[PDB]
Amino acid sequence: VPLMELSGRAPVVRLHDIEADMAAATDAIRSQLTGWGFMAAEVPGIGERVEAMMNEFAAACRATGPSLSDYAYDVVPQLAVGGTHGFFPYKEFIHVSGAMIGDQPGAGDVLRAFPAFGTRAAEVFDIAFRLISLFGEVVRGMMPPGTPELDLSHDATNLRVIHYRHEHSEIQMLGLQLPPSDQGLQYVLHDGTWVEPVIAGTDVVLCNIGRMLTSASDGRFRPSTHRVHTKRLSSVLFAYPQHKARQWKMVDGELMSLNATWGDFID
Numbered sequence: 001v002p003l004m005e006l007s008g009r010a011p012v013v014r015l016h017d018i019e020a021d022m023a024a025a026t027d028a029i030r031s032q033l034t035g036w037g038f039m040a041a042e043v044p045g046i047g048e049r050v051e052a053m054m055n056e057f058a059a060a061c062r063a064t065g066p067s068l069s070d071y072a073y074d075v076v077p078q079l080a081v082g083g084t085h086g087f088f089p090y091k092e093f094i095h096v097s098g099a100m101i102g103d104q105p106g107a108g109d110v111l112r113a114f115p116a117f118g119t120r121a122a123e124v125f126d127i128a129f130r131l132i133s134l135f136g137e138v139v140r141g142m143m144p145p146g147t148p149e150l151d152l153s154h155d156a157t158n159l160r161v162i163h164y165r166h167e168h169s170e171i172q173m174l175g176l177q178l179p180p181s182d183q184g185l186q187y188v189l190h191d192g193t194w195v196e197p198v199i200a201g202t203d204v205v206l207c208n209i210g211r212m213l214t215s216a217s218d219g220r221f222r223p224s225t226h227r228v229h230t231k232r233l234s235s236v237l238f239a240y241p242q243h244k245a246r247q248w249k250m251v252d253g254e255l256m257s258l259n260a261t262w263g264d265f266i267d
Protein backbone atom coordinates (compact mmCIF):
# COMPACT_ATOMS: atom_id res chain seq x y z
CA VAL A 1 0.00 0.00 0.00
CA PRO A 2 1.41 3.40 -0.99
CA LEU A 3 2.37 5.83 1.75
CA MET A 4 0.69 9.24 1.71
CA GLU A 5 2.90 11.96 3.20
CA LEU A 6 0.96 14.80 4.82
CA SER A 7 3.52 16.69 6.95
CA GLY A 8 4.20 19.92 5.10
CA ARG A 9 1.41 19.40 2.56
CA ALA A 10 -1.70 19.66 4.77
CA PRO A 11 -2.86 23.09 5.96
CA VAL A 12 -1.25 24.31 9.18
CA VAL A 13 -3.58 25.03 12.10
CA ARG A 14 -1.95 26.47 15.23
CA LEU A 15 -3.10 25.68 18.75
CA HIS A 16 -3.60 29.31 19.76
CA ASP A 17 -5.27 30.29 16.47
CA ILE A 18 -7.54 27.33 15.71
CA GLU A 19 -10.62 29.30 14.62
CA ALA A 20 -8.73 31.62 12.23
CA ASP A 21 -6.33 29.04 10.79
CA MET A 22 -9.26 26.73 9.97
CA ALA A 23 -11.01 29.57 8.14
CA ALA A 24 -7.88 30.01 5.99
CA ALA A 25 -7.70 26.25 5.46
CA THR A 26 -11.32 25.99 4.27
CA ASP A 27 -10.58 25.77 0.53
CA ALA A 28 -7.85 23.17 1.01
CA ILE A 29 -10.05 21.11 3.33
CA ARG A 30 -12.94 21.17 0.85
CA SER A 31 -10.66 19.88 -1.89
CA GLN A 32 -9.39 17.11 0.39
CA LEU A 33 -12.95 15.94 1.00
CA THR A 34 -13.75 16.08 -2.72
CA GLY A 35 -10.49 14.50 -3.83
CA TRP A 36 -9.77 12.03 -1.02
CA GLY A 37 -12.94 11.32 0.98
CA PHE A 38 -11.28 12.44 4.22
CA MET A 39 -9.60 15.60 5.49
CA ALA A 40 -6.30 16.41 7.19
CA ALA A 41 -4.54 19.20 9.07
CA GLU A 42 -1.15 19.67 10.73
CA VAL A 43 -1.41 20.94 14.29
CA PRO A 44 2.04 21.87 15.67
CA GLY A 45 2.46 20.57 19.19
CA ILE A 46 -0.51 18.13 19.05
CA GLY A 47 1.76 15.12 18.63
CA GLU A 48 3.62 15.50 21.91
CA ARG A 49 0.36 15.99 23.82
CA VAL A 50 -1.20 12.91 22.20
CA GLU A 51 1.93 10.78 22.71
CA ALA A 52 2.09 11.76 26.40
CA MET A 53 -1.62 10.95 26.81
CA MET A 54 -1.23 7.61 25.06
CA ASN A 55 1.91 6.63 26.98
CA GLU A 56 0.20 7.46 30.27
CA PHE A 57 -2.89 5.49 29.25
CA ALA A 58 -0.55 2.54 28.57
CA ALA A 59 0.89 2.83 32.09
CA ALA A 60 -2.63 3.06 33.54
CA CYS A 61 -3.65 -0.14 31.73
CA ARG A 62 -0.99 -2.03 33.75
CA ALA A 63 -1.73 -0.26 37.08
CA THR A 64 -3.23 -2.51 39.71
CA GLY A 65 -4.00 -1.00 43.06
CA PRO A 66 -6.73 1.23 41.61
CA SER A 67 -7.10 -0.62 38.22
CA LEU A 68 -8.69 0.93 35.09
CA SER A 69 -11.20 -1.94 35.23
CA ASP A 70 -12.53 -0.37 38.45
CA TYR A 71 -14.02 2.10 35.91
CA ALA A 72 -15.39 -0.41 33.43
CA TYR A 73 -18.49 1.02 31.73
CA ASP A 74 -20.84 -1.25 33.69
CA VAL A 75 -19.68 0.21 37.05
CA VAL A 76 -19.45 3.88 35.90
CA PRO A 77 -22.52 6.14 36.27
CA GLN A 78 -24.04 6.58 32.81
CA LEU A 79 -26.44 9.14 31.37
CA ALA A 80 -30.09 8.11 31.28
CA VAL A 81 -30.11 8.94 27.56
CA GLY A 82 -26.76 8.68 25.83
CA GLY A 83 -23.82 6.54 24.90
CA THR A 84 -21.54 4.60 27.20
CA HIS A 85 -18.37 6.12 28.66
CA GLY A 86 -15.81 4.38 30.85
CA PHE A 87 -13.29 1.60 30.36
CA PHE A 88 -13.70 -1.40 28.04
CA PRO A 89 -11.48 -4.30 29.19
CA TYR A 90 -9.99 -6.93 26.90
CA LYS A 91 -8.36 -4.43 22.30
CA GLU A 92 -8.67 -2.49 25.54
CA PHE A 93 -9.80 1.15 25.45
CA ILE A 94 -11.58 3.94 27.31
CA HIS A 95 -14.29 6.35 26.21
CA VAL A 96 -13.83 9.75 27.83
CA SER A 97 -17.06 11.63 27.14
CA GLY A 98 -17.57 15.36 27.55
CA ALA A 99 -20.08 14.41 30.26
CA MET A 100 -17.36 12.42 32.05
CA ILE A 101 -14.96 15.41 31.91
CA GLY A 102 -17.67 17.44 33.63
CA ASP A 103 -18.37 14.63 36.15
CA GLN A 104 -21.85 13.89 34.79
CA PRO A 105 -21.49 12.66 39.18
CA GLY A 106 -18.98 9.94 39.85
CA ALA A 107 -18.51 9.51 36.09
CA GLY A 108 -15.38 11.64 36.47
CA ASP A 109 -13.85 9.23 39.01
CA VAL A 110 -11.67 7.40 36.44
CA LEU A 111 -10.06 10.79 35.75
CA ARG A 112 -9.46 11.50 39.43
CA ALA A 113 -8.02 7.98 39.82
CA PHE A 114 -5.53 8.54 36.97
CA PRO A 115 -5.27 12.36 36.91
CA ALA A 116 -2.09 12.49 34.86
CA PHE A 117 -3.73 10.61 31.99
CA GLY A 118 -7.00 12.36 32.75
CA THR A 119 -5.54 15.87 32.59
CA ARG A 120 -3.96 15.07 29.21
CA ALA A 121 -7.18 13.47 27.96
CA ALA A 122 -9.25 16.53 28.88
CA GLU A 123 -6.70 18.74 27.12
CA VAL A 124 -6.71 16.64 23.96
CA PHE A 125 -10.51 16.34 24.05
CA ASP A 126 -10.87 20.14 24.08
CA ILE A 127 -8.43 20.69 21.21
CA ALA A 128 -10.01 17.86 19.23
CA PHE A 129 -13.54 19.10 19.83
CA ARG A 130 -12.65 22.63 18.68
CA LEU A 131 -10.95 21.24 15.55
CA ILE A 132 -13.73 18.79 14.68
CA SER A 133 -16.47 21.41 15.11
CA LEU A 134 -14.70 23.59 12.52
CA PHE A 135 -14.17 20.63 10.18
CA GLY A 136 -17.93 20.23 10.60
CA GLU A 137 -18.51 23.86 9.61
CA VAL A 138 -16.40 23.31 6.47
CA VAL A 139 -18.46 20.25 5.49
CA ARG A 140 -21.66 22.19 6.16
CA GLY A 141 -20.45 25.01 3.90
CA MET A 142 -20.16 22.41 1.11
CA MET A 143 -23.83 21.48 1.57
CA PRO A 144 -26.92 23.22 0.13
CA PRO A 145 -28.19 26.51 1.61
CA GLY A 146 -30.57 25.95 4.46
CA THR A 147 -28.42 23.15 5.91
CA PRO A 148 -28.81 23.25 9.73
CA GLU A 149 -25.70 23.62 11.79
CA LEU A 150 -24.23 20.29 12.82
CA ASP A 151 -24.70 21.18 16.54
CA LEU A 152 -22.15 18.64 17.77
CA SER A 153 -22.83 17.86 21.45
CA HIS A 154 -19.92 18.36 23.87
CA ASP A 155 -21.37 15.91 26.41
CA ALA A 156 -22.16 13.18 23.86
CA THR A 157 -18.82 13.44 22.04
CA ASN A 158 -16.16 11.10 23.34
CA LEU A 159 -12.46 10.56 23.04
CA ARG A 160 -11.43 6.93 22.63
CA VAL A 161 -7.87 5.94 23.66
CA ILE A 162 -6.93 2.38 22.55
CA HIS A 163 -4.19 0.01 23.72
CA TYR A 164 -3.27 -2.91 21.35
CA ARG A 165 -4.97 -1.60 18.13
CA HIS A 166 -10.98 -4.57 9.14
CA GLU A 167 -12.64 -2.29 6.56
CA HIS A 168 -15.02 -0.08 8.56
CA SER A 169 -16.54 3.34 8.76
CA GLU A 170 -17.56 5.28 11.75
CA ILE A 171 -21.16 5.58 12.75
CA GLN A 172 -21.06 9.12 14.17
CA MET A 173 -21.09 12.50 12.44
CA LEU A 174 -17.32 13.02 12.32
CA GLY A 175 -14.22 11.33 13.68
CA LEU A 176 -10.93 13.06 14.38
CA GLN A 177 -8.03 10.62 14.12
CA LEU A 178 -5.16 11.77 16.29
CA PRO A 179 -1.54 10.74 15.54
CA PRO A 180 -1.18 7.10 16.56
CA SER A 181 1.93 5.51 18.02
CA ASP A 182 2.50 3.30 14.95
CA GLN A 183 1.84 3.26 11.23
CA GLY A 184 -0.89 1.02 9.91
CA LEU A 185 -4.12 2.97 9.62
CA GLN A 186 -5.16 2.99 5.96
CA TYR A 187 -7.89 4.72 3.94
CA VAL A 188 -9.62 3.89 0.65
CA LEU A 189 -9.68 6.61 -2.00
CA HIS A 190 -12.61 7.36 -4.33
CA ASP A 191 -11.08 5.03 -6.94
CA GLY A 192 -11.12 2.09 -4.51
CA THR A 193 -7.36 2.00 -3.87
CA TRP A 194 -5.84 2.04 -0.40
CA VAL A 195 -3.35 4.57 0.93
CA GLU A 196 -1.50 4.62 4.25
CA PRO A 197 -1.25 8.19 5.64
CA VAL A 198 2.09 9.02 7.37
CA ILE A 199 0.74 10.18 10.76
CA ALA A 200 2.70 8.22 13.41
CA GLY A 201 5.02 10.55 15.33
CA THR A 202 3.53 13.52 13.51
CA ASP A 203 1.35 16.55 14.19
CA VAL A 204 -1.20 15.51 11.53
CA VAL A 205 -4.83 14.84 12.44
CA LEU A 206 -7.34 13.21 10.08
CA CYS A 207 -11.02 14.07 10.00
CA ASN A 208 -13.42 11.23 9.06
CA ILE A 209 -16.88 11.47 7.57
CA GLY A 210 -19.14 9.24 9.65
CA ARG A 211 -22.33 7.44 8.68
CA MET A 212 -24.50 10.01 10.44
CA LEU A 213 -23.15 12.73 8.15
CA THR A 214 -23.58 10.51 5.09
CA SER A 215 -27.23 10.20 6.12
CA ALA A 216 -27.73 13.90 6.90
CA SER A 217 -26.15 14.86 3.55
CA ASP A 218 -28.33 12.14 1.86
CA GLY A 219 -25.30 10.46 0.24
CA ARG A 220 -23.28 13.50 -0.92
CA PHE A 221 -20.38 12.64 1.39
CA ARG A 222 -19.48 8.93 1.56
CA PRO A 223 -18.15 7.53 4.93
CA SER A 224 -14.39 7.71 5.27
CA THR A 225 -13.79 3.97 5.20
CA HIS A 226 -10.54 2.79 6.81
CA ARG A 227 -8.75 -0.21 8.31
CA VAL A 228 -5.70 -1.00 10.45
CA HIS A 229 -2.87 -3.23 9.10
CA THR A 230 -0.13 -3.64 11.73
CA LYS A 231 3.29 -5.29 11.35
CA ARG A 232 0.84 0.03 19.76
CA LEU A 233 -1.67 2.78 20.82
CA SER A 234 -4.18 5.10 19.07
CA SER A 235 -6.85 7.65 19.87
CA VAL A 236 -9.76 9.22 18.03
CA LEU A 237 -12.56 11.64 18.86
CA PHE A 238 -16.09 10.63 17.86
CA ALA A 239 -18.47 13.60 17.61
CA TYR A 240 -22.25 13.10 17.57
CA PRO A 241 -25.09 15.62 17.96
CA GLN A 242 -27.57 15.47 20.88
CA HIS A 243 -28.94 11.92 21.26
CA LYS A 244 -32.52 13.12 21.81
CA ALA A 245 -32.51 15.53 18.84
CA ARG A 246 -34.50 14.61 15.73
CA GLN A 247 -32.66 13.53 12.61
CA TRP A 248 -32.59 15.69 9.50
CA LYS A 249 -31.61 15.17 5.89
CA MET A 250 -30.92 17.43 2.90
CA VAL A 251 -32.76 15.64 0.10
CA ASP A 252 -32.29 17.25 -3.32
CA GLY A 253 -31.72 20.58 -1.56
CA GLU A 254 -34.65 20.66 0.87
CA LEU A 255 -34.48 20.29 4.65
CA MET A 256 -36.24 17.21 5.78
CA SER A 257 -37.08 16.63 9.45
CA LEU A 258 -37.42 12.98 10.50
CA ASN A 259 -39.13 11.49 13.52
CA ALA A 260 -36.25 9.24 14.57
CA THR A 261 -33.52 10.72 16.75
CA TRP A 262 -29.77 10.61 16.41
CA GLY A 263 -29.80 8.10 19.27
CA ASP A 264 -32.11 5.92 17.18
CA PHE A 265 -29.56 6.01 14.35
CA ILE A 266 -26.99 4.17 16.48
CA ASP A 267 -29.38 1.42 17.49
Ligand SMILES: [Fe+3]
Pocket (backbone or CB within 6 Å): 168, 169, 170, 226
Ligand atom coordinates in the same frame (compact mmCIF):
# COMPACT_ATOMS: atom_id res chain seq x y z
FE1 LIG B 1 -12.14 3.54 13.06
